[PDB]
Amino acid sequence: EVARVRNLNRIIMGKYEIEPWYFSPYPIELTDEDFIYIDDFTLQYFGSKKQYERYRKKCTLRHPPGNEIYRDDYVSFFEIDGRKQRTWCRNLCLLSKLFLDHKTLYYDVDPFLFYCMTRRDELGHHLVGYFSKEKESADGYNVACILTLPQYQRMGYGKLLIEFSYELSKKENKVGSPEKPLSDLGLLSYRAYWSDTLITLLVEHQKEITIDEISSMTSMTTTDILHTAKTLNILRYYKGQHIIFLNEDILDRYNRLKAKKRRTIDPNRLIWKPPV
Ligand SMILES: CC(C)(COP(=O)(O)OP(=O)(O)OC[C@H]1O[C@@H](n2cnc3c(N)ncnc32)[C@H](O)[C@@H]1OP(=O)(O)O)[C@@H](O)C(=O)NCCC(=O)NCCS
């Protein structure tokens, strides 16, 4: 007799069988099996396919449990108060931790708002990613953690999540930046977003733009703007203050960007007021 005591080596979520990157503290028994089922609507976890199936038949809504504050032909965003949806949000944090080196205690979700993005097609809503945000951040962080589910990564969804987080800041009349320290993947995604943003402004708005103007239009912090401008070699002094400026390199980058034909967030479709 050999008694196997296995780690969680795969989760089964819809048709996907996904291997975790890191340990997550799912409060489950260790058995001779190395999988659990994650329901793609409720995010509930099950040790057995039969138990999963039993609950799957229950009558449930087929999208995340919050208010739909943005809806276009491609995606929806749902805003969820962690305090009002404790179970679902705890389940979301357990799932997220499988793909993070560290995360704040999964159980305590009350301090957070969760912004969950779905793709909609002929089959309805499919959760593809989220970002969390502190209700009250001492550092003014506009994102706490951000995640695209692995089965959906490298399809452009992460950039949409970032873009949406800044649209909230803009509506709030505040600048913001993601919580640090940031994972390498998280930081490289932000640098690409910040870079594409400055490039797009230079081509579509004005050939020369001040720091104040950029900050007003984007809610990016002075620090993130300057770091991005220096990387692109577009920082100058003109008419008595620092600006970024257009050149041939930027034009070329812009044309390559547009060639990719990627989706963006339409600020006009964000129907939302800050708490006040
Ligand atoms: C950071 C993270 C959210 C990025 O999400 P994502 O959806 O993969 O991001 P995107 O798809 O917008 O961009 C990722 C890459 O895919 C590429 N890509 C996007 N759409 C593509 C397409 N249609 N075809 C090919 N490549 C594409 C992008 O160019 C980018 O490539 P790069 O390596 O040249 O930058 C994701 O890596 C993640 O969830 N990581 C773990 C969570 C984490 O560490 N979070 C930090 C906060 S706690």
Contacts of 158 (CB under 8 A, 6+ apart): 129, 146, 148, 189
Nearest CA to ligand 1 atom 9: 158
Q: For residues 11 and 38, give the distance between their C-alpha atoms in angstroms, rounded to a whole number.
A: 7
Q: Which of 45, 90, 99 is nearest to 65 (CA)?
A: 90
Report the separation in Å between the CA atom of 160 and the middle of ligand 1, taken as the mean of its atom positions: 10
Instruction: Decide: 145 in ligand 1 pocket, CB within 6 A.
Output: yes
CB 171 within 8 A of CB 272: yes
Q: Which CATH number fits domain 182-262: 3.50.30.10, 1.10.10.10, 3.30.56.10, 3.40.50.1980?
A: 1.10.10.10
Which long-range contacts (C-beta less than 8 Å, at least 24 apart) are formed by 132-136? 132/82, 133/165, 133/168, 135/111, 136/111
Cross-strand bridge partners of residue 12: 17, 37
3-state secondary structure at position 117:
strand
- CATH of region 61-181+263-276: 3.40.630.30
Cross-strand bridge partners of residue 244: 209, 235
Q: Which of 19, 149, 155 has most ligand 1 atoms within 8 Å of CB, for mutation? A: 155
Q: Which of 159, 143, 226 is nearest to 192 (CA)?
A: 159
3-state secondary structure at position 238:
strand
Query: Domain ranges in the chain?
Result: 8-60, 61-181+263-276, 182-262
| Start-end of H helices in the chain | 49-56, 86-97, 157-171, 184-204, 211-218, 222-231, 248-259
* Catalytic residue (choose from 1, 179, 204, 213): 179
3-state secondary structure at position 178:
strand
CB 55 within 8 A of CB 44: yes
- 172 catalytic residue (yes or no): no
DSSP state of 220: B
Q: For residues 116 and 128, give the distance between their C-alpha atoms in angstroms, rounded to a whole number.
A: 8
Cross-strand bridge partners of residue 77: 70, 117
Which segments are annotated as binding site? 144-148, 153-159, 183
Which segments are annotated as binding site for acetyl-CoA? 144-148, 153-159, 183
**Structure tokens given for 19:** 């291997």
Instruction: Decide: 100 in ligand 1 pocket, CB within 6 A.
Output: yes
| Percent helix, strand and coil across the chain, each to the nearest 5 | 35, 25, 40
Instruction: Decide: 64 in ligand 1 pocket, CB within 6 A.
Output: no
CA within 13 Å, CB half, 39: 23
Cα-trace Rg, the chain = 21
Q: Which of 236, 253, 254 is nearest to 245 (CA)?
A: 236
Ligand 1 atom at minimum distance from 160 CA: 12
Report the separation in Å between the CA atom of 188 and the middle of ligand 1, taken as the mean of its atom positions: 9
Q: For residues 6 and 193, give the distance between their C-alpha atoms in angstroms, rounded to a whole number.
A: 40
3-state secondary structure at position 68:
strand
Maximum separation of any 2 CA atoms in the chain, in Å: 81
Report the separation in Å between the CA atom of 183 and the middle of ligand 1, taken as the mean of its atom positions: 12
**Structure tokens given for 72:** 């276009």
**Pairing mode of beta strands 35-38, 16-18:** unpaired
Q: For residues 46 and 177, give the distance between their C-alpha atoms in angstroms, rounded to a whole number.
A: 37
Query: Cα 234 from chain centroid?
Result: 28
CA distances from 96 to 46, 93, 166, 190, 235 (A): 17, 5, 21, 19, 38
Q: For residues 161 and 147, give the distance between their C-alpha atoms in angstroms, rounded to a whole number.
A: 9
Fold of 8-60: Wheat Germ Agglutinin (Isolectin 2); domain 1 (3.30.60)
Q: For residues 20 and 198, give the distance between their C-alpha atoms in angstroms, rounded to a whole number.
A: 35
Report the separation in Å between the CA atom of 37 and the middle of ligand 1, taken as the mean of its atom positions: 25
- The b/e string for 46-67 (b: 16+ C-beta within 10 A; e otherwise) is beeeeebeeebeeeeeebbbbe
Ligand 1 atom at minimum distance from 21 CA: 41
3-state secondary structure at position 2:
coil
Report the separation in Å between the CA atom of 189 and the middle of ligand 1, taken as the mean of its atom positions: 6
Q: For residues 130 and 257, give the distance between their C-alpha atoms in angstroms, rounded to a whole number.
A: 24
Instruction: Decide: 148 in ligand 1 pocket, CB within 6 A.
Output: yes
